[PDB]
Symmetry: D2
Subunit: 250 residues, 4 copies
C-alpha cells in the first residue's frame, strides 16, 4: 500500500496556474519528473519554472497553445526528446467564459471546443506512443457538467465530452495496459478567486460552500491527491471511471 | 390525456434516412408541420420529399450540410420564413466512423465534432428565437457514450457532449418556457443494416439483441414515440433529462 | 401517434393523496380501469371514492397497509377477483420522515424500508402473474436519492433501491413482454404543501423553486403525463430506464 | 497515504474481498477489527495471520442480520479500540433465485444483511468515528447494469449509494466522509474452488466484458480502500468510486 510514484514521468497540461499548478508541484515534490505546458509567458509561468528548478528532478515547462495542433505536435517532439517515455498524462488545461448562450459567438464556441475537447484529444493521441505498454491517463472533468450552469453550456458540453472520450479509450486500450479516467471537480480555490477582494469573494465562497457536503471549497492539493492515486498501481483495476473530487457538492 | 400534437411545427435535422426519417414521417402523420434537412441529394431525400407532400400538411425538406455554419444560418432563414415559429426541434443528424484511435486523422475528428456537436449547437442557437416562450428541444444521444466502444471514441465524445450542452441550456432557458432533453438510443435497425447481406446482418442482430432486456433491436418508430412524448405537454415538467430508449441494453 | 390507454387495467398504490391521487384520476378520466389502495380512511379516501364513481369505468379503492405482507396478499386476492388481469402497475405508495440519523430508531428505519422497498417488491411480485405476457411496471423514485438530503438517508436509501430492483427486473422479464421503469420526481405540489400556515407556504416553495430549471414545483398531473407515456405502447422500447420528471431540479 | 496507526473496522473479513482488505490494511500497520457470521477454516486461519503480523487486530462473530449482535460487536469495538478512523461495510450475501419464486424470507435475509446491516453498522460507528473518519461501503457495478435472478441483491447494493449520498450531506461538516466502492467481478476462493472447466468458462465470460481483460482481486479493492481511508482523499465524499476494470 504505497503510491510508488518516485521516478515516474508525467505530462500535465496547463501547469502555470490553478489546479494544474498544484498538481505539477505536488507530483514534483513526490519525485515525479513533470513536463508541463502553458499558453502564454507570464509571471505565473516564470515563477513555475523557478520552483521547478528549486526542486530536485528533471522537470520542463514549455509554451504551447493547445488550440494550435502544430504547437501540440511540437510539445510532444520536446517530450519525446527529453523524456522519451511517459507514465502519466493529466489533461488539465481548459478555458471558460460566461456569455448568454444566444449571444455566444461561433468563434468563442470554437475556442472552448478547441482547447477543452480537441486539445485534450490531440494531447492523448500524441501521448499514446509515449505511454507504451503501461500508463495512466487522467482528464479533468467537472461536476457542473451533470448539474448545468447558465451561461456556460459550451463549457459543460466540452467537459462532459471528456467522459465519453475516456470511456471509449478505456475500452480500446485496456488490454494494452493503458488506463483512462476522469476526475470530476467541484469548486476549487484558485488564484483567480483569491485575486478577488473580500466582498466578491467571501460571497462566492459561502455561496458555493453551502452547496457542498464538506462546507468548504477544494484546493489544488486535494485534486493532486486523487491524481496521485490514479497515477499509482494502487488504482490498477480502475479504468473508464469518473472519480468525483468535489466535496459532495449539490 | 392526449398528445395534442396537431398543428405544431417541428424541425428535424437529418430526416432523409434512418431514425430521423421515422421521426419525420410519424410526426407528419400526426398532423405536425415538419421541417427537415439533409446533407446531399439522394434517392432517400427524393422519396422522402414525395411522401411528405402526398401526406396532408405543410412540410419542407431542404439540403443543408450541418458541417457548414452558413448553410445552417440559411436553413434557418428559410425556416423563419416558411414557419415563422417552432414548437419542437430534434437534433438527429449525426455521423459515425470506426477508426483505430491512434490512426484517427485530425480532419475526421473535426468532421465528427462539426456535425455531431457543433452542428447541433448551431441549430439550437438559431432555433431559440423561433421557439419563443414555449418550445421543446430534443437531442438524439446514445447509450453507447456511457458504455464506451472501441474505435469510436470521437463519436462517444460528441454524443456525451450533447448531455452537457442540454443540461446547461435547460437551466438557462427553463424560466423562459424552453425545455431541453436528450434521447439516448440503444441499437436501432436502419436501412444500412437491412442493406447488408443476410447474416452479417443476422449475426450482429443477434449480437446486439443478446445485450438488450427485450431481446430485439429498436425501430425508428419507437424513437418517434419518445419524440412525440417530449414534444407534447404531457412532458411539460421534463427538462434537462436523458431519456433512454434503448431496450434495456447492457 | 396516440396513447391508447382506453380499456387498460391499472393498479396504483397510494392513490388517496398527492402524486398517487393525481395519477389515479388522470388514468381514470382517460378510460383506464384503476385499482388503487391507501393506508387509512380519511377525507381523502372518501372524496377519491366519490370522485371515481362519477366517472365511467370499473374503479376500486381499498385499504391495505403495505407494511403488512398479508394485507398485500389480501389486496391481490381482491385485484384477482375484481380485475383478473393487469396491464399497468404504479408503485407510488411511499413514506418519509426527517430524523437526525444518529437518532433514527431501528423501527422507523424498518418502517420506511417495509413500505418503500419491501412493499414495492411484494406488489410487483404479486402483480407479475396478473400482468401475463404484456405489462408495464412503473415505480416512483426521487431525484433526491442522487443528491442526498440530511435527515432522510433512510428515505433516499429506499428510493435508490427501487432503481436497482427495476434494472434487474427489466433484464429478467423483458423477453416475456414485461417492462420496468422508474419515474424520478423532483418536488411536487401536494395537499401536505397546502396545509402549512404560509409561515412556509412559502419559504419552502421559493427554496425548492429556485433549485429547478423551470422555476416552479411539479404537479401530480405532470407526473401522470409520464405515467401515461410509460403505460402506453409509445414507450414500448423503453425498459430499465430512470425517467426524470423533476423540472430540471439540482 | 499515512495509514500506519489508524483503527479500522471491516465487516465480513474472513473470505474474499473483505479478507484481502483486512490483510492489506493490517500489513500497512492499521489496527483492524473484523467480523464474520460462522466460525470456519477461513476465520481461524485469518486469526492466525493477524497474530503473525502483530498489531492490535480482532476478529469476532457477529451475524449482521441480527441488530442485537451488531450492538454487541460495537461494544467490543468500543472497548478494544475506543475510537475508529475507517469503516468498511463489506459483508454481503447474494443468491440467484427466479424473482417470481423468491421467498419473502430470502428477500428479507438479503435486505437485513446488505442494507439494514450496513445501516446499523454505520449508525453504531458514528459515535466512535468522532471528529474525523472515513466510511466506505462496498457496492456493485451490476446494480447499474441489472442482472437476472438477483434483483433483490441489486436493490440492496443500489440502496447503499442513496444512503451514502445523504449521510455525506448530513455529516460532512462534522468531519465524516462517506463513499461507495462499486466493484466489478472479483476473483475469490469461491471461484478457484470450481473445476477447471466451469471456472475457465466463467473467467472468459466476465473478462470479455471488462476493459482490462481480467477479473479483479481483493488486493486491487484494498488499494481503493486505502486511498479513501487516507487524507489524500479528504475532499472526496458522497462519491461512487468504480473499481471494476471498466466492465460494461
Ligand atoms: N473550481 C474550478 O476551478 C474547476 C476547474 N475545472 C477544470 O480544471 C482545469 C483547470 O482549472 P483552473 O485551474 O481553475 O483554470 P485556470 O484558468 O486557473 O488555469 C488553466 C490552466 O490551463 C492553461 N491553459 C488555458 N488555455 C490553454 C491553452 N490554449 N493552451 C495551453 N494551456 C492553456 C493555462 O495556461 P496560461 O497561464 O498560459 O493561460 C492555465 O495554466 C480546467 O480543465 C477546468 O475546467 C473543473 C471544474 C471546477
Ligand atoms: N443504432 C442507431 O441507429 C444509433 C443512432 N444514434 C444517433 O441517431 C441519429 C441518427 O442515427 P441514424 O439514423 O442511425 O443515422 P443515418 O446514417 O441513418 O443518417 C441519419 C441522417 O443524418 C443526416 N446527416 C449526416 N450528416 C449530415 C449533415 N452534415 N448535415 C445534415 N444531415 C446529415 C443524414 O443525411 P444524408 O442522407 O444526406 O447522408 C441522414 O439523413 C444520430 O445522431 C446517431 O448518433 C444513437 C445511438 C445508436
Ligand atoms: N411529492 C414529492 O415532492 C416527491 C414524491 N416522491 C415519491 O412519490 C410518491 C408519492 O408520494 P407523495 O404524494 O408525495 O406523498 P403522500 O403522503 O401525499 O401520499 C402517499 C400515499 O401513499 C398511501 N399508501 C398506501 N399504503 C401505504 C402505506 N403502507 N404506507 C404509506 N402510504 C401508503 C398513502 O395512503 P394514506 O392516505 O392512508 O396515508 C398515501 O395516499 C412517493 O412514493 C414519494 O416518495 C419522490 C420525490 C419527491
Ligand atoms: N465479484 C465479487 O466478488 C463482488 C463482490 N461485491 C461485494 O463485496 C462484498 C464481499 O463480497 P465477496 O468477497 O465476493 O463475498 P464472500 O461470500 O466471499 O464473503 C462475504 C464475507 O462477508 C461475511 N458475511 C456474510 N454475511 C454476513 C453476516 N450476516 N454477518 C457477518 N458476516 C457476513 C462472510 O462471513 P462468513 O464466512 O461467516 O460467511 C464473509 O466473510 C459484498 O458486499 C459484495 O456485494 C460487489 C460486486 C462484485
Amino acid at each position: 500500500l504505497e503510491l510508488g510514484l518516485r521516478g515516474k514521468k508525467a505530462l500535465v497540461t496547463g501547469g502555470s496556474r490553478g489546479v494544474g499548478r498544484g498538481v505539477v508541484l505536488a507530483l514534483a515534490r513526490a519525485g515525479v519528473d513533470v513536463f508541463t505546458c502553458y499558453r502564454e509567458e507570464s509571471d505565473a509561468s516564470a515563477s513555475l519554472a523557478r520552483e521547478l528548478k528549486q526542486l530536485g528532478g528533471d522537470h520542463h515547462a514549455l509554451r504551447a497553445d493547445l488550440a494550435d495542433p502544430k504547437q501540440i505536435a511540437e510539445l510532444f517532439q520536446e517530450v519525446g526528446r527529453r523524456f522519451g517515455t511517459l507514465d502519466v498524462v493529466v489533461n488539465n488545461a481548459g478555458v471558460i467564459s460566461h456569455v448568454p448562450y444566444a449571444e455566444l459567438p461561433v468563434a468563442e464556441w470554437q475556442r472552448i471546443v478547441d482547447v477543452n475537447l480537441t486539445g485534450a484529444h490531440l494531447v492523448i493521441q500524441h501521448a499514446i506512443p509515449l505511454l507504451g505498454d503501461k500508463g495512466s491517463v487522467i482528464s479533468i472533468g467537472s461536476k457542473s457538467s451533470e448539474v448545468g450552469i447558465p451561461l456556460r453550456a459550451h463549457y459543460t458540453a466540452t467537459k462532459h465530452a471528456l467522459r465519453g472520450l475516456t470511456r471509449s479509450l478505456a475500452k480500446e486500450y485496456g488490454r494494452s495496459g493503458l488506463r483512462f479516467n476522469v476526475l470530476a471537480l467541484g469548486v476549487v480555490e484558485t488564484e483567480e478567486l483569491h485575486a478577488l477582494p473580500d466582498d466578491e469573494r467571501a460571497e462566492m465562497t459561502k455561496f458555493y460552500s453551502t452547496k457542498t457536503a464538506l462546507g468548504r471549497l477544494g484546493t489544488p492539493d486535494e485534486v493532486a491527491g486523487a491524481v496521485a492515486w490514479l497515477a499509482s498501481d494502487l488504482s490498477r483495476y480502475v479504468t473508464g471511471a469518473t472519480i468525483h473530487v468535489d466535496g459532495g457538492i449539490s
